[PDB]
């Protein structure tokens, strides 16, 4: 039903000289092209204030282009660059966009195009989205065509600021025209989730309060914010990865089955489950800030020269959640994330219930682990009779390591899969306005509580520690049963 972009589509990246542009956006575009998923007739134009040539732009991005075949597909490289051009102009005034409109109509009139297909990728901070989107609607909007603009998760920092942005954004571009980017929704293992649960009775029949004891979404990084402490100070780990990325994953884990194949039926079920969340319990949290390492070799968060002496900024947080609907009523849900922990990992952990009396009740709980970022894998904790004469049980980890299957296929990077979905007009992996509204309604009261003057002091944990003090208790207090 939604029109697919193929031939004579023109892709304009705004903020092309910027870092996100040259390191991720152009690399992703070349990824698609190198693998035969970008049409040779695509016009790619980079736009920014700075005054560089086609050569500089092409040479700025050439290092970051991913060459998985080495010296092979070198012609694909050189061929992709020839599709790329640059235009200089300010974001704040019409002339840049009026020039840009001339190049594009020239390329498009040169071909049998009576339906211009335009993708605008805004590789920019949100403070400029609105300027650029205003100028795009003022100067570069064809009723006879289809245009789509991609913007990124940054957006706002609480309900008020996110609302104010969308209030300005809605009169410019409909939800059909906006593609909001939450990079986790482009990750392979995240994309697999809906089919994994809804497509397999082995999971879907157990996927309810009758059989699940505990749902965890887990984010660990082994490094702090050294050098960027003052930037992180007004963000914190909850804004950084939990209100957005982790909540997206949680939503895919807990939503009901979409009843149609329209991409908006997926988004409807995410919005629906979000609205079912009970308010966050401000006391049901564990809050940490990373201090000096036990080693002495790693600084504290406060050791950073751009952090004030008294910062209560949270670098680790475990938050409890409650969804009040028929599927999840009473199931404790924990989201936990932290920098400067002991490993780097993004992971879903689901623990299943045991029957209480009967033969195999002293047996351990089943458990499902979906690793997202590192070695994309699925692990199932199972029980089985000890082979042979014995009748004792033994637990078996079934390793569904997807890493072996993923070398037989081309597994794209998140931005490559997301840009592809945009070209196809599929909003399934993009954030809708009401989804955004509700997810900020859920998290703003907690952030207001933490960042108020009477908000609590995070407990200090050493850099590189496995998990701050109280975490293991907090999990036991949220339905998790530890075992040997």
CB neighbours (10 Å) of residue 161?
13
Answer for the pair 203, 174: CB distance below 8 angstroms, yes or no: no
In 142-192, alpha helices (H): 159-169, 188-191
Answer for the pair 429, 417: CB distance below 8 angstroms, yes or no: yes
Interhelix angle 54-61/26-34, nearest 10 degrees? 80
Answer for the pair 69, 105: CB distance below 8 angstroms, yes or no: no
- The answer to whether 245 is a known catalytic residue is yes
Give the whole-angstrom CA distance, residue 282 versus residue 188. Answer: 33
Q: Which of 403, 395, 407 is nearest to 378 (CA)?
A: 403
Q: Please indicate if the annotation marks 37 as binding a ligand.
A: no
Q: Please indicate if the annotation marks 124 as binding a ligand.
A: no
Q: What is the 3-class SS of 347-377, one letter each residue?
A: EEEEEECCCCCCHHHCCCCCEEEEECCCCCE
Give the whole-angstrom CA distance, residue 370 versus residue 197. Answer: 12
Q: Please indicate if the annotation marks 20 as binding a ligand.
A: yes
Buried b (16+ CB within 10 A) or exposed e, 392-416: eeeeeeeeeebeeeeeeeeebbbbb
Q: Please indicate if the annotation marks 432 as binding a ligand.
A: no
Answer for the pair 386, 393: CB distance below 8 angstroms, yes or no: yes
Give the whole-angstrom CA distance, residue 327 versus residue 197. Answer: 14
Q: Find where tokens 């907090």 sit.
A: 474
Q: Please indicate if the annotation marks 265 as binding a ligand.
A: no
Q: Please indicate if the annotation marks 336 as binding a ligand.
A: yes
Q: Please indicate if the annotation marks 380 as binding a ligand.
A: yes
C-alpha dihedral (211, 214, 219, 220), degrees to nearest 10: -120
366 token code pair? 């089943």
Q: What are phi and psi of 18, to 5 degrees?
A: -65, 170
Classified as helix, coil or strand, 46 is strand
Give whole-number Cα distances, 61 to 30, 91, 265, 414, in Å.
10, 22, 38, 18
Give the whole-angstrom CA distance, residue 463 versus residue 478. Answer: 25
Give the whole-angstrom CA distance, residue 34 versus residue 25. Answer: 14
Sheet holding 212-220, edge to edge: 393-399, 377-385, 367-371, 345-352, 212-220, 333-338, 316-321, 285-291, 459-462
DSSP 8-state symbol, 255: P
Answer for the pair 479, 214: CB distance below 8 angstroms, yes or no: yes
Q: What are phi and psi of 199, to 5 degrees?
A: -85, 0
Q: What are phi and psi of 262, to 5 degrees?
A: -65, 135
364 token code pair? 């351990």
In 83-215, alpha helices (H): 94-109, 126-139, 159-169, 188-191, 193-198, 201-204
Answer for the pair 136, 176: CB distance below 8 angstroms, yes or no: no
Q: Which of 439, 426, 366, 369 is nearest to 401 (CA)?
A: 369
Q: Please indicate if the annotation marks 345 as binding a ligand.
A: yes
Q: Please indicate if the annotation marks 91 as binding a ligand.
A: no
Q: Please indicate if the annotation marks 214 as binding a ligand.
A: no
160 token code pair? 């008020």
Q: Please indicate if the annotation marks 186 as binding a ligand.
A: yes
344 token code pair? 């780097």
Helix (H) or strand (E) holding 150: strand 146-152
Interhelix angle 159-169/126-139, nearest 10 degrees? 10
Catalytic residue among 117, 157, 245, 427: 245
Classified as helix, coil or strand, 380 is strand
DSSP 8-state symbol, 454: T
Residue by residue, DSSP assigns 395-423 as EEEEE--TTTGGGTS----HHHHHHHHHH
CB neighbours (10 Å) of residue 149?
24
Give whole-number Cα distances, 102 to 17, 31, 116, in Å.
21, 28, 13
Which residues does residue 333 pair with via DSSP β-bridges, in sequence order?
Answer: 215, 321
What method was applied to determine this entry?
Answer: X-ray
Q: Which of 100, 91, 98, 163 is nearest to 130 (CA)?
A: 91
Q: Which of 154, 128, 340, 342 is nearest to 235 (CA)?
A: 154
Q: Please indicate if the annotation marks 349 as binding a ligand.
A: yes
Q: Which domains does the chain have, with CATH numbers?
A: 9-184 (3.40.50.720), 185-477 (3.30.360.10)
Give the whole-angstrom CA distance, residue 171 versus residue 377. Answer: 43
Q: Please indicate if the annotation marks 153 as binding a ligand.
A: yes
The reported resolution of this PDB entry, expressed in Å, is 2.7
R_g of the chain computed on alpha carbons:
24
DSSP 8-state symbol, 461: E
For residue 64, count CB atoms less than 10 angstroms from its CB and return exposed for 0-12, middle for 13-18, buried for 19 or more. middle
Which residues does residue 146 pair with via DSSP β-bridges, in sequence order?
Answer: 117
Q: Please indicate if the annotation marks 470 as binding a ligand.
A: no
Give whole-number Cα distances, 409 to 35, 185, 188, 385, in Å.
11, 19, 12, 36
Helix (H) or strand (E) holding 117: strand 117-122
323 token code pair? 């969804």
217-221-223 Cα angle (round to 5): 160
Answer for the pair 288, 460: CB distance below 8 angstroms, yes or no: yes
Strand 178-181 and strand 146-152: the pairing is: parallel
Q: Please indicate if the annotation marks 267 as binding a ligand.
A: no
25 token code pair? 């956006």
């Amino acid at each position: 039903m939604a029109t697919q972009f193929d031939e004579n589509t023109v892709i304009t990246i705004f903020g092309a000289s910027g870092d996100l542009s040259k390191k991720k956006t152009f690399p992703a575009l070349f990824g698609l092209y190198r693998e035969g998923y970008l049409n040779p007739t695509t016009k790619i134009i980079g736009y920014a204030r700075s005054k560089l040539s086609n050569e500089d732009l092409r040479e700025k991005v050439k290092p970051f282009l991913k060459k998985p075949n080495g010296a092979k597909d070198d012609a694909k490289v050189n061929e992709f660059l020839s599709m790329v051009s640059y235009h200089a102009g300010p974001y704040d005034s019409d002339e840049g966009y009026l020039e840009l409109k001339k190049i594009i109509e020239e390329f498009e009139a040169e071909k049998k195009v009576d339906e211009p297909h335009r993708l605008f990728y805004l590789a920019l901070p949100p403070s400029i989205f609105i300027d650029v989107c205003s100028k795009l609607k003022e100067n570069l909007y064809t009723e006879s065509g289809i245009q789509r603009v991609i913007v990124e998760k940054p957006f706002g920092h609480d309900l008020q600021s996110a609302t104010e942005l969308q209030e300005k954004l809605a009169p410019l571009f409909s939800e059909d025209e906006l593609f909001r980017i939450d990079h986790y929704l482009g990750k392979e293992m995240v994309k697999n989730l809906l089919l994994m649960r809804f497509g397999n009775t082995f999971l879907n029949a157990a996927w309810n309060k009758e059989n699940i004891q505990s749902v965890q979404v887990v984010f660990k990084e082994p490094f702090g914010t050294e050098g960027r402490g003052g930037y992180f100070d007004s963000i914190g780990i909850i804004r950084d990865v939990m209100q957005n990325h982790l909540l997206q994953v949680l939503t895919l884990l807990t939503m009901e089955r979409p009843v149609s194949f329209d991409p908006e039926s997926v988004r409807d079920e995410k919005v629906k489950v979000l609205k079912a969340f009970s308010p966050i319990d401000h006391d049901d949290i564990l809050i940490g800030q990373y201090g000096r390492s036990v080693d002495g070799s790693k600084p504290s968060y406060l050791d950073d020269e751009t952090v004030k002496e008294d910062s209560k900024c949270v670098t680790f947080a475990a938050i409890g959640f409650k969804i009040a609907n028929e599927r999840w009523d009473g199931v404790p849900i924990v989201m936990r994330a932290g920098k400067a922990l002991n490993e780097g990992k993004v992971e879903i952990r689901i623990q299943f219930r045991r029957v209480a009396s009967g033969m195999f009740t002293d047996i351990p709980n089943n458990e499902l682990v979906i690793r997202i970022q590192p070695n994309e894998a699925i692990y199932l904790k199972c029980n089985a009779k000890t082979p042979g004469l014995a009748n004792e049980n033994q637990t078996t980890e079934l390793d569904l390591t997807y890493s072996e299957r993923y070398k037989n296929y081309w597994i794209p990077e998140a931005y490559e899969s997301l840009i592809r979905d945009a070209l196809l007009g599929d909003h399934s992996n993009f954030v809708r306005d009401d989804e955004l509204d509700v997810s900020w309604k859920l998290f703003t009261p907690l952030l207001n509580y933490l960042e108020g003057p009477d908000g609590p002091q995070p407990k200090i944990y050493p850099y590189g520690c496995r998990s701050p003090d109280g975490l293991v208790e907090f999990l036991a207090d949220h339905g998790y049963t530890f075992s040997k």
